[PDB]
Amino acid sequence: GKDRTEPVKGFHKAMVKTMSAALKIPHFGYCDEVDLTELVKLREELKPIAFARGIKLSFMPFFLKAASLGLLQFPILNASVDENCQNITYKASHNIGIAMDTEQGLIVPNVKNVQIRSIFEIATELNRLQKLGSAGQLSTNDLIGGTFTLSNIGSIGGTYAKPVILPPEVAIGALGTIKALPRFNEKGEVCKAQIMNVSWSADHRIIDGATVSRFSNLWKSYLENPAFMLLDLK
Amino acid sequence: GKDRTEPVKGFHKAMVKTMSAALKIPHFGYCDEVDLTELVKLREELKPIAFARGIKLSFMPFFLKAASLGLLQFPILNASVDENCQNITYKASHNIGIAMDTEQGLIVPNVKNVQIRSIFEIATELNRLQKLGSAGQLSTNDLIGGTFTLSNIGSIGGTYAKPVILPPEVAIGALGTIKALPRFNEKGEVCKAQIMNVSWSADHRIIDGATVSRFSNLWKSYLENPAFMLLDLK
Amino acid sequence: GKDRTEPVKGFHKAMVKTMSAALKIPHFGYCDEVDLTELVKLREELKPIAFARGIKLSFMPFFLKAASLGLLQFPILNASVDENCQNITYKASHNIGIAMDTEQGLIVPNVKNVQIRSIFEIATELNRLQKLGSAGQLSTNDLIGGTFTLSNIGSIGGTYAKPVILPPEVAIGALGTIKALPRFNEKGEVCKAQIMNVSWSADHRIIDGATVSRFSNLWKSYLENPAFMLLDLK
Amino acid sequence: QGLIVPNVKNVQIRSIFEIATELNRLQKLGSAGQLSTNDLIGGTFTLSNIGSIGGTYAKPVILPPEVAIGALGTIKALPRFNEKGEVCKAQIMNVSWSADHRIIDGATVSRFSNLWKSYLENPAFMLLDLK
Ligand SMILES: CC(C)(COP(=O)(O)OP(=O)(O)OC[C@H]1O[C@@H](n2cnc3c(N)ncnc32)[C@H](O)[C@@H]1OP(=O)(O)O)[C@@H](O)C(=O)NCCC(=O)NCCS
Ligand SMILES: CC(C)(COP(=O)(O)OP(=O)(O)OC[C@H]1O[C@@H](n2cnc3c(N)ncnc32)[C@H](O)[C@@H]1OP(=O)(O)O)[C@@H](O)C(=O)NCCC(=O)NCCS
Ligand SMILES: CC(C)(COP(=O)(O)OP(=O)(O)OC[C@H]1O[C@@H](n2cnc3c(N)ncnc32)[C@H](O)[C@@H]1OP(=O)(O)O)[C@@H](O)C(=O)NCCC(=O)NCCS
Ligand SMILES: CC(C)(COP(=O)(O)OP(=O)(O)OC[C@H]1O[C@@H](n2cnc3c(N)ncnc32)[C@H](O)[C@@H]1OP(=O)(O)O)[C@@H](O)C(=O)NCCC(=O)NCCS
Ligand SMILES: [Cl-]
Ligand SMILES: [Cl-]
Ligand SMILES: [Cl-]
Ligand SMILES: [Cl-]
């Protein structure tokens, strides 16, 4: 009924400082649509097996493993730049941030070394961070050393987004809601296709659009043809 | 064949000032598509009733009243922050700005206290502002006090946008053109669906993606099912 | 492996400077889809005529000629602004940047005076630029004096993007990948439409949404209805 | 020369791609008569792809001191039912395992075979635990 002023305090101060710092980064945005039909079917087949082992298996572990495979080819997306952008540190660990919605607000823990982990282990680490995240119990180790971030806003809604990069990282992807849309198959007939949008943001000071685009294409081909991931996993 | 330099003068100086101030805000972007099939039908049905009371009825009154109801659930989107972003002021009045194209060109008056007004009253105040707007006779009062803004760029063109927040506001929505697209109904059949895109921008220092995605879903659920708006109005 | 630090060197030093400068600009973004079915058909029937004259004809000469015709109507889009945005310098030449991918990364040469050239001359000039580009042999003159940029990221992938304006330019366009999507014709039948996305960014200090929108529409009508371009060409 | 049995080392740490790379290496060496000592020794288990020439079932002989072997027949297209009861083109392969019955029982070979087979029938089940 009246106006009400109220201090920004406690953990809310971190979002302020992080996003203010991100003003220093000139964001380039690139978007695509990915055809997740085969992946929806794949995830249905594997959901039981995961369930029997005590794991809820969403799409994220796939998005994460495909990201990491992309980062092997485009290691500049898993990198950091210094205050003046004079040097790049290419980071070897894929510590991939999971932006996560909580009752208390936004928090971003990461899954360490996705590069050495199976989809199933990623699923397992996810659950763990989700349980911990919702209980206010994430450790300091869960919150530091992130190298790259994915923000599945699509578990709530959306198509495209424009996500803000977390310094000191240089890139971030946001995933919209998987939605059934009419599309052509190879014959030229209209099918039910499960389509998801992706929105990447990158530090345009050292990352150009061809790089992001080729990264996205590789990422995309892994999810549109999960077979492709089999070739090189161990 | 000749280059020409020219001062920015008169009202044009205002846009320079606003948009420069907007650089201090780290913009988060979030987008979605909204099925406006029922609302187009609803509006057709109200057009003659509105005409007879001497009022042009577009979609904007629907959008506005839906935004207001949303803001009641997410008051943080109707708020300001101070210079260093250390205090939030939750504003009680929904004075929703209407970005308006005129011959001189860009101006943003607002409809005061939407939260107390019917769709019909919002139509009436909108007409009044359009009348004064295209004659260059908007008063001072119609221009100050904005708490939130909608930008109907879709009356001219477009799908998605990246609109820029008007300080000291913290969010803004842009609406693209309502276009007929092939979409699936519940029965799995390809229908004619009246799709509109919306793109929101919000001050990421204090507003996370979950909050805007939820606000967006609520707004959207009101427009996708106008019925639901019936439920709580007096 | 292990982390590796490394200096930013050589022609990479340019992208850091340029993209930092772009922070001074409040970017407004506006996107649309454009139906290229007719242009695809047109281009197919001109390919053999261009090949026979020694030239590869992509869609870019069409996009560039349309853009130029658009800039004649909305010349504020081929303009620059001074250090504090006090004066606008409208530029007569349309020297249109072609964002271009090479082994050494991103380079932006331009085609000089598009306004006075034919679709075939543009293509010729574009080809001269591709040959020099991929040889790393572009000259200083090919690189300076740009007034406006198009970025055909779609030759690699994508739908929408958020391209960054190259100062002292004031606008940029990004084109996504042309892709067959189910769309309605006038008769209300579902058919195969070659859809391309376009994303525009403009310096919102002096250019409003209405302006970009109208420009985009004109640009778009030239591409949707290629014969509209006949009318005023000499 | 006749029959030769080199092995791919440490399949358990290699990817399908690297396994194929090593197969190519061995096929080439093997057909030049150049397989080396180290390629011939340390075998722990054996596959006999006789189906690259012909066959359905087989009775392969285990190579001591290993305790098991599988032979694979020729993949051929046979009428099979799908999940609806309709008749489909199905690419069928037979497998034959021999095991040392002094220590391996039939449930073991069967359970192992079920598992091997679910990986092949449902390749994405292999996705789940590879790194
Ligand atoms: C932490 C988080 C990423 C976990 O995501 P997750 O691995 O998908 O796990 P969730 O438990 O939330 O989701 C599981 C369910 O939602 C569905 N879902 C998740 N992502 C989806 C998508 N993009 N499209 C459609 N459905 C989706 C899953 O299919 C699953 O449904 P089912 O259980 O009926 O099979 C998610 O909870 C979250 O916090 N999202 C918000 C991120 C955010 O706030 N971003 C903005 C940053 S400013
Ligand atoms: C002030 C303004 C928002 C009022 O919009 P409005 O309430 O829709 O009223 P209008 O008189 O402009 O529009 C009326 C017609 O356009 C149509 N229209 C309006 N919005 C539409 C949309 N988003 N999609 C499709 N059609 C639309 C309406 O259906 C109506 O059509 P009809 O009379 O045949 O039934 C609008 O005129 C305007 O200035 N838009 C531009 C906003 C802008 O410049 N933003 C840029 C910010 S940088
Ligand atoms: C220099 C450049 C713009 C020239 O593009 P171009 O004139 O289309 O010429 P190209 O030779 O590269 O491409 C021609 C082929 O690709 C196809 N293609 C080009 N643009 C396309 C589009 N957007 N959608 C689908 N296909 C397209 C053309 O049809 C042509 O096809 P064809 O050979 O089968 O007949 C382009 O090669 C390039 O470098 N793109 C990168 C832009 C970029 O880096 N942007 C990011 C900036 S941060
Ligand atoms: C070394 C060897 C195992 C390699 O097998 P491989 O990995 O399939 O490689 P090849 O070059 O032989 O394959 C040739 C083709 O035959 C096909 N083929 C191989 N095995 C097949 C089988 N199980 N069913 C149907 N086709 C088969 C492959 O698809 C490949 O096909 P393509 O070229 O048309 O795409 C094989 O060449 C061999 O020596 N076979 C005989 C085994 C034997 O002697 N065992 C008995 C021990 S007493
Ligand atoms: Cl920027
Ligand atoms: Cl669509
Ligand atoms: Cl930002
Ligand atoms: Cl901005």
Side-chain angles (χ1 to χ4, degrees):
Chain A
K2 325 274 178 156
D3 281 9
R4 177 180 52 100
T5 306
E6 203 147 296
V8 175
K9 275 185 36 166
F11 197 82
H12 294 127
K13 276 179 140 164
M15 212 185 35
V16 181
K17 147 145 162 207
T18 297
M19 302 298 161
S20 293
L23 298 161
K24 291 150 171 177
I25 303 175
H27 282 63
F28 166 76
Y30 162 102
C31 300
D32 204 1
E33 108 170 18
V34 45
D35 182 343
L36 287 198
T37 301
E38 212 53 26
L39 221 224
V40 170
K41 145 171 195 179
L42 179 86
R43 177 186 173 251
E44 284 300 291
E45 295 182 25
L46 293 181
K47 219 199 299 155
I49 296 90
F51 159 98
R53 303 189 196 182
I55 299 313
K56 296 202 263 266
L57 177 64
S58 74
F59 299 94
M60 280 292 285
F62 305 89
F63 297 159
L64 270 340
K65 193 67 190 172
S68 159
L69 292 175
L71 303 170
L72 291 182
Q73 295 300 298
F74 302 92
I76 196 172
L77 303 170
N78 197 71
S80 271
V81 305
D82 59 347
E83 186 53 20
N84 295 147
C85 208
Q86 318 267 65
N87 306 93
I88 177 159
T89 300
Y90 294 81
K91 311 223 201 171
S93 295
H94 294 173
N95 296 344
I96 302 190
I98 310 306
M100 68 160 63
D101 172 43
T102 69
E103 183 117 41
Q104 297 304 148
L106 177 55
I107 219 289
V108 193
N110 52 90
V111 174
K112 310 285 193 270
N113 306 297
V114 172
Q115 73 300 337
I116 48 111
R117 301 223 227 169
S118 65
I119 281 166
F120 173 68
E121 293 159 329
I122 296 160
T124 295
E125 188 55 35
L126 249 183
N127 301 182
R128 189 182 78 84
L129 306 175
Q130 308 170 255
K131 292 182 208 292
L132 256 28
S134 67
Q137 278 304 120
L138 282 166
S139 73
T140 299
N141 293 316
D142 304 313
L143 277 7
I144 72 168
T147 60
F148 184 89
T149 299
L150 291 175
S151 173
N152 187 27
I153 192 54
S155 66
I156 308 160
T159 50
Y160 291 113
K162 196 236 126 212
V164 185
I165 306 183
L166 264 27
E169 295 152 32
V170 295
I172 183 163
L175 315 150
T177 295
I178 295 162
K179 212 190 199 293
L181 294 173
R183 295 289 190 263
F184 297 118
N185 60 359
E186 253 123 48
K187 308 162 213 246
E189 306 155 335
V190 177
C191 309
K192 180 199 213 49
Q194 301 299 150
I195 301 295
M196 187 185 60
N197 306 108
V198 63
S199 286
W200 300 107
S201 285
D203 190 334
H204 210 343
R205 290 176 299 180
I206 43 148
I207 295 169
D208 52 32
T211 299
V212 175
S213 175
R214 278 178 199 117
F215 169 75
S216 195
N217 288 352
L218 185 49
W219 183 78
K220 196 162 121 158
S221 69
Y222 292 136
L223 304 170
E224 299 192 341
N225 312 274
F228 283 17
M229 289 187 286
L230 263 194
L231 231 214
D232 307 306
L233 292 188
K234 287 161 206 181
Chain B
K2 260 268 135 230
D3 284 3
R4 190 175 82 275
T5 306
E6 213 143 294
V8 186
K9 273 233 211 313
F11 212 63
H12 294 117
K13 271 213 271 309
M15 201 172 65
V16 188
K17 274 329 155 62
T18 283
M19 303 302 165
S20 299
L23 293 170
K24 283 153 180 165
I25 295 171
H27 281 64
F28 166 70
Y30 171 90
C31 299
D32 204 359
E33 85 165 27
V34 186
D35 186 327
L36 279 186
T37 313
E38 269 258 81
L39 219 217
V40 182
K41 184 196 164 217
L42 174 46
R43 193 189 156 241
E44 278 312 300
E45 293 168 34
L46 294 183
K47 268 211 276 185
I49 309 318
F51 172 92
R53 308 200 205 166
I55 281 299
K56 264 160 224 195
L57 183 58
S58 64
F59 298 92
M60 283 297 284
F62 301 95
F63 300 156
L64 268 349
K65 185 53 158 187
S68 182
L69 286 162
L71 265 6
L72 283 181
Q73 294 311 305
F74 301 95
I76 200 178
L77 293 178
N78 210 64
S80 286
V81 296
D82 55 355
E83 298 143 36
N84 330 308
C85 194
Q86 299 159 133
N87 299 99
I88 304 172
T89 299
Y90 296 87
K91 275 170 185 201
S93 285
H94 299 168
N95 300 332
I96 308 198
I98 312 297
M100 195 184 284
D101 171 59
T102 65
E103 295 204 44
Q104 333 124 53
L106 181 66
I107 195 162
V108 193
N110 53 77
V111 181
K112 311 293 204 251
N113 295 304
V114 176
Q115 76 292 345
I116 53 156
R117 290 190 208 271
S118 60
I119 289 163
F120 172 74
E121 288 161 328
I122 300 159
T124 291
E125 182 74 40
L126 233 206
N127 284 199
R128 190 182 75 72
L129 304 161
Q130 289 180 263
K131 177 125 296 201
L132 287 173
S134 95
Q137 293 189 244
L138 279 159
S139 63
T140 280
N141 279 307
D142 290 329
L143 266 14
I144 64 169
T147 63
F148 183 89
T149 298
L150 297 173
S151 179
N152 188 22
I153 198 56
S155 66
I156 305 163
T159 56
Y160 286 116
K162 181 278 184 143
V164 173
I165 312 164
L166 267 31
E169 294 171 24
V170 297
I172 177 153
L175 319 143
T177 303
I178 303 164
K179 185 184 201 340
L181 293 164
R183 290 273 186 279
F184 293 122
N185 59 15
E186 283 180 38
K187 297 171 74 163
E189 281 153 341
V190 174
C191 297
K192 192 187 183 113
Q194 299 302 147
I195 303 310
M196 195 189 61
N197 314 103
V198 55
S199 304
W200 306 100
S201 280
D203 187 329
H204 212 342
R205 291 166 308 173
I206 59 169
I207 298 187
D208 56 36
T211 300
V212 10
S213 178
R214 283 187 202 110
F215 165 78
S216 189
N217 295 349
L218 182 51
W219 176 79
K220 154 162 149 170
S221 78
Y222 287 138
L223 301 168
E224 305 208 314
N225 329 263
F228 287 14
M229 263 186 286
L230 247 190
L231 201 264
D232 288 317
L233 299 175
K234 302 163 185 225
Chain C
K2 322 168 235 164
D3 293 1
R4 177 196 20 124
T5 302
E6 203 164 290
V8 179
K9 293 166 154 326
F11 226 64
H12 293 114
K13 236 186 253 203
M15 206 184 40
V16 178
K17 262 182 40 173
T18 291
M19 297 302 165
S20 301
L23 298 161
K24 284 166 214 146
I25 307 173
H27 287 55
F28 169 74
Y30 167 99
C31 308
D32 209 345
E33 69 171 43
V34 13
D35 176 345
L36 289 189
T37 311
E38 263 286 342
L39 223 205
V40 173
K41 207 192 87 166
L42 166 58
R43 170 179 173 263
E44 283 303 315
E45 57 188 55
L46 295 178
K47 269 211 278 165
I49 304 324
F51 162 94
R53 302 191 193 168
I55 298 297
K56 290 161 88 163
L57 184 76
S58 67
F59 298 92
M60 281 300 276
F62 297 95
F63 301 155
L64 257 4
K65 190 34 145 173
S68 172
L69 288 184
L71 295 160
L72 296 175
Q73 294 310 299
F74 302 94
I76 195 165
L77 295 172
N78 198 77
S80 285
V81 136
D82 56 9
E83 190 199 296
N84 263 119
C85 201
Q86 292 221 152
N87 303 102
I88 304 174
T89 298
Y90 299 77
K91 297 201 184 134
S93 286
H94 303 166
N95 302 327
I96 306 193
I98 316 303
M100 158 181 317
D101 185 52
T102 74
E103 297 261 284
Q104 201 175 43
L106 179 67
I107 199 155
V108 204
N110 52 74
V111 177
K112 309 288 198 273
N113 297 303
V114 182
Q115 70 295 341
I116 59 136
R117 285 192 205 262
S118 60
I119 273 152
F120 171 86
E121 292 158 321
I122 291 156
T124 302
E125 183 51 47
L126 217 213
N127 285 199
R128 200 192 47 95
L129 296 172
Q130 298 163 263
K131 180 127 273 128
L132 287 194
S134 72
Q137 297 197 254
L138 285 163
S139 70
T140 302
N141 287 300
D142 290 330
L143 265 3
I144 66 161
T147 63
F148 184 91
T149 297
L150 285 183
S151 174
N152 183 27
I153 190 70
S155 52
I156 301 180
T159 59
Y160 293 115
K162 175 262 163 163
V164 181
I165 303 159
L166 268 12
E169 297 169 36
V170 294
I172 189 163
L175 322 152
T177 302
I178 306 178
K179 149 186 214 13
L181 293 176
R183 291 284 180 266
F184 287 123
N185 61 20
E186 284 178 32
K187 310 165 103 299
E189 304 163 335
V190 166
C191 63
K192 201 193 205 70
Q194 304 293 153
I195 297 304
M196 192 183 77
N197 309 101
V198 61
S199 297
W200 301 106
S201 310
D203 184 343
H204 206 356
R205 274 163 322 168
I206 46 156
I207 305 199
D208 58 27
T211 303
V212 169
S213 189
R214 283 176 197 124
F215 160 83
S216 184
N217 294 354
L218 178 59
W219 179 75
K220 198 215 189 166
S221 74
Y222 285 148
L223 298 175
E224 291 184 348
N225 314 273
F228 283 30
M229 287 192 269
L230 269 182
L231 236 211
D232 301 302
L233 294 187
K234 319 181 201 311
Chain D
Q1 229 55 19
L3 180 81
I4 242 269
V5 188
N7 52 88
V8 175
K9 317 282 162 197
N10 280 306
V11 164
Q12 77 292 336
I13 54 171
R14 299 226 232 174
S15 60
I16 281 162
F17 179 70
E18 304 159 322
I19 289 160
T21 295
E22 182 68 8
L23 259 203
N24 283 206
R25 203 183 65 81
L26 306 172
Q27 295 176 264
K28 176 160 206 168
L29 253 26
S31 82
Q34 314 270 241
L35 278 171
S36 87
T37 280
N38 194 69
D39 302 327
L40 267 1
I41 57 128
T44 63
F45 182 90
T46 295
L47 295 193
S48 183
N49 184 22
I50 190 51
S52 79
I53 306 177
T56 45
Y57 297 110
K59 186 261 185 153
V61 178
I62 300 154
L63 317 169
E66 299 167 15
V67 301
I69 185 159
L72 313 150
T74 297
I75 305 167
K76 48 171 329 164
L78 297 172
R80 285 293 178 269
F81 284 123
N82 68 355
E83 293 224 351
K84 313 194 230 281
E86 292 153 350
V87 175
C88 287
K89 199 184 225 208
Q91 298 293 149
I92 306 296
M93 201 193 52
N94 306 111
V95 61
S96 301
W97 308 98
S98 295
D100 181 335
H101 214 358
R102 303 173 292 178
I103 35 135
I104 310 304
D105 68 29
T108 292
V109 25
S110 189
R111 277 188 205 107
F112 155 81
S113 195
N114 286 338
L115 183 53
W116 182 75
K117 192 211 189 172
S118 61
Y119 288 133
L120 299 176
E121 283 178 357
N122 319 271
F125 287 18
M126 297 195 264
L127 253 193
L128 217 219
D129 303 310
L130 308 176
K131 300 171 224 261

